[PDB]
Design a protein around this ligand. Structure first.
Ligand SMILES: O=C(O)c1ccc[n+]([C@@H]2O[C@H](COP(=O)([O-])O)[C@@H](O)[C@H]2O)c1
Ligand SMILES: O=C(O)c1ccc[n+]([C@@H]2O[C@H](COP(=O)([O-])O)[C@@H](O)[C@H]2O)c1
Ligand SMILES: c1ccc2[nH]ccc2c1
Ligand SMILES: c1ccc2[nH]ccc2c1
Lengths: 346, 346
């Protein structure tokens, strides 16, 4: 894992410079395509993309797992929904499945800790049947976190060897906005009250309890904010650890990763804390309607492209933004040039 | 034209109700897909869509024309660029062409007043070689505005009879952010200084002159803000009138129209002033980087889905948002249902 983190490549400034020069010469006022241009340049800096903004195969990795903190009454969805929805993922009927199909991407469902019998068709990487209840102790051991980070990292990179050039990250797990809020609070130094949201339609009257649970998780575990792995293992979860591993893996293979919503922000904070070299590979998708979204995004210095007030998860926002990444590539390669039209602008 | 405006259909509330009920039953927490859900319902209310959110063929109509106010030094792009870019539109090398192709939409280039010889391959609807300089008088006569509104309206609807169900609107015309600013100022009652932007890279030192030109256009023409056609004919332009006509035409044929950037906001303000019944058919795409964008959008009560800091025009933002409209349709038709999985949520 030390080797992994050490070998994350830095962006290729040379390729980025050639990209900018080319974009500036396209048939349009310089900078007129705004963020689509900066995105194209960002992609050109990623080693796995071969010095140019391009998208080959697309994949969305969905990490599924249950949480012991569910027993604290922080979620209104039945616990079994995690298992049920993971099965639906293999049938193509879920929100991320439909959006991914629309984007021409394949969905990979990975079980990293669902509390139920193994589901056929789902990639098996389960650590245990659900993680520990963060309200009274740690979610898992540091070793369990490190092993899963490594496992997921290799899997992610291995796909790269099969033509995948763009990754999307997602999750599935009832009650996971609680550990996500705890992590955000710890990494950003914000009070729990500022970061706790309604998750999957939690009644307004039950918010206070959720805020209390988050505070207890932090007080009892005392996670070290300067150690991302310590935070993930103490107040995080298997699904959040797995999302973090996708990001470290893609970064190691020099490829881009599209974040999703609130849960993915938490994992991204952890990943950047663990290895700052990961930041250049992250691409925001949408702006989650979860309460703590603004704060999490601020500390990541990211501005989502899409404002859809979405809060489903599963990597649905990630899939929805894939066409945008392809648009930046299409702009770069298919547009004509000013010089070819004898057009000169001041 | 009176018949046209009178026959614009009202949204089908019955179909909208059936849509909501169906969306609420999909495999996800109610309302979790946010704006994607409201969009699907909006589409279901449009008569030309046959009671359901669906997208058949897609088209982007680009209105090209020159402006006499160009001589006032409000634009740094050579006047000929309008003609050159219109030709490029027929070659598929422009920004909107590339983005439209990515979205599977066809681009229609319509010349409503380019100041140059006719361009082969471009739909010919030219009113004159450029409109009058709004700084010293009106852009055109009221009759010329009304005739073009009617012409463009019929053309738009006629395409509907060929399978088009989703329209995108766009323009091309050096100096057109000046008349667009004048219109916005008049419709919203905002001072010119608050609505004038840099358009296509206008140097910061030349802004003052642009603000002055806008004020003179308004003082000299005295456009009536309660008469959208009066405003368009006095301080607008052929291209802006044509965009307005696309919106009235699509609304008349009960179909959706995707706005683009700043210029399209102006036209949309005019259209809604002329016929409020048009509003339900308009769908925002992105948030233009032009200075007066926020104000224009506020008076239209619209919140764009995309924040790309784009300011190219051509209908490029419109094309970029088409995949989003299709996503709402895909969600509606392809997702599974909660009941089928025996999932019950409070
Ligand atoms: O991605 C988001 O921003 C998001 C925001 C709120 C809720 N969710 C989803 O809803 C679940 C977490 O909600 P909850 O109330 O059980 O903590 C989980 O399975 C996520 O996929 C996802
Ligand atoms: O769509 C926008 O928001 C937009 C904002 C700024 C500039 N433009 C484009 O640039 C041109 C208008 O800029 P200008 O400086 O000549 O007034 C015109 O051809 C538009 O297509 C377009
Ligand atoms: C200068 C060059 C290309 C362009 N496309 C749209 C406006 C514009 C201005
Ligand atoms: C309840 C029902 C379906 C779901 N998909 C993702 C979270 C979730 C909760």
């Amino acid at each position: 894992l030390h080797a992994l983190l050490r070998d994350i490549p830095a962006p290729d400034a040379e390729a980025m410079a050639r990209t900018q020069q080319h974009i500036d010469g396209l048939l349009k006022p310089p900078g007129s395509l705004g963020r689509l241009e900066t995105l194209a340049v960002q992609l050109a800096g990623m080693p796995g993309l071969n010095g140019t903004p391009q998208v080959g195969e697309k994949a969305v990795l969905v990490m599924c797992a249950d949480h012991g903190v569910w027993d604290e009454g922080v979620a209104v969805s039945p616990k079994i929904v995690t298992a049920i929805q993971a099965a639906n993922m293999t049938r193509g009927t879920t929100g991320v499945c439909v959006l991914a199909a629309q984007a021409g991407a394949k969905v990979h469902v990975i079980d990293v800790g669902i509390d139920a019998e193994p589901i056929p068709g789902v990639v098996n990487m389960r650590v245990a049947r659900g993680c520990g209840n963060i309200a009274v102790g740690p979610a898992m051991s540091r070793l369990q976190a490190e092993a899963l980070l490594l496992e997921v990292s290799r899997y992610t990179c291995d796909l790269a060897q099969r033509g995948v050039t763009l990754f999307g990250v997602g999750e599935l797990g009832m009650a996971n906005t609680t550990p996500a809020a705890a992590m955000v609070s710890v990494f950003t130094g914000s009070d729990a009250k500022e970061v706790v949201g309604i998750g999957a339609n939690l009644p307004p009257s039950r918010i206070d309890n959720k805020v209390d649970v988050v505070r207890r998780a932090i007080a009892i575990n005392q996670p070290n904010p300067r150690d991302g792995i310590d935070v993930l293992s103490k107040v995080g979860g298997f699904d959040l650890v797995g999302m973090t591993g996708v990001m470290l893996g893609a970064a190691r293979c020099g490829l881009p990763v599209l974040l999703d919503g609130f849960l993915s922000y938490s994992a991204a904070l952890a990943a950047c804390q663990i290895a700052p070299a990961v930041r250049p590979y992250l691409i925001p998708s949408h702006f989650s309607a979860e309460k703590g979204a603004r704060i999490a995004l601020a500390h990541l210095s990211m501005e989502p492209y899409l404002h859809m007030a979405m809060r489903l998860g599963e990597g649905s926002g990630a899939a929805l933004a894939m066409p945008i990444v392809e648009a930046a590539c299409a702009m770069f390669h298919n547009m004509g040039e000013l010089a070819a039209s004898n057009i000169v602008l001041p």
